[PDB]
Every structure is written in C-alpha cells, then in structure tokens.
Amino acid sequence: GMRIPSAIQLHKASKTLTLRYGEDSYDLPAEFLRVHSPSAEVQGHGNPVLQYGKLNVGLVGVEPAGQYALKLSFDDGHDSGLFTWDYLYELATRKDQLWADYLAELASAGKSRDPDESVVKLML
C-alpha cells in the first residue's frame, strides 16, 4: 500500500519512536531502530552484519527526507541511509519478533548490546 505517518515522536527523554500503523499506535525503542538500519546510500555493498556495543544509543533528531522516507539521526550512529515509509511501518508492527531474533544473534556471536557486558553463565 502506502503507510505515511501523522504521529511522529522520538521521545528524546526515553528515546522511543512512536508511530500509528493505520489505527494502531506502537512505541519502538531507539536501540532496535539503530541495529535494524538497512543503509541505502551504500551503493556498492549490502552484507548482513551484527550491530553490537550499541545499547546506550539514543535518538537525537528526525525530519522528513522529502515525501518517501524519514531522515533519522542516532547519537551512536552515522546519520545516513533511507528508511522509506512502508518499511518504517513494517518495523512498527514487527519489532518484538525481530528483537527476539536479534537477541539470539547477540547471544551467540559472543558480543553484547551493552558496551561492557559480562556473560558469566555456562549453559552450553
């Protein structure tokens, strides 16, 4: 279709993107959106690489990049890439499942969200 927002909030005190998919109003965190950032002005590469040591990011700013994508700035980022519209809303209704998925990646890659985490279990 198209899904173009009217609620835009980055909630800078809590770094939360709020959006409204059709009727339904969701509020996603900044650290999810940094790692789920398919850069789009790469123009030569596109590997899936795990993005870790990024937990304490926040959102710093947000303005519409024309009519088809939303320019998004991240404190612990590089403020480049397109997010489109329909991909933003796709994420808006998917985050938890994608998060649970990205957790298992971080769990087993022997890295962490946290810049200085301490995996001190033994379960495998």
DSSP string, 47-81: ------S-TT--EEEEEE-SSS-EEEEETTS----
Report how many domains make up the chain: 1
Tokens 């790469």 found at: 42
17/122 Cα distance (integer angstroms): 36
Return the residues preceding each gap in the chain, C–N over 2.5 A, or none: none
Specify the experimental method.
Answer: NMR
35, containing H or E segment: helix 30-35
Tokens 């033994």 found at: 122
Tokens 């059709």 found at: 22
**Which letter does DSSP use for residue 9 in this model?**
B
How do beta strands 59-64 and 24-29 pair? Answer: unpaired
Domain that includes residue 10, residue range: 1-124
Q: Which residues pair with 28 in a beta bridge?
A: 17
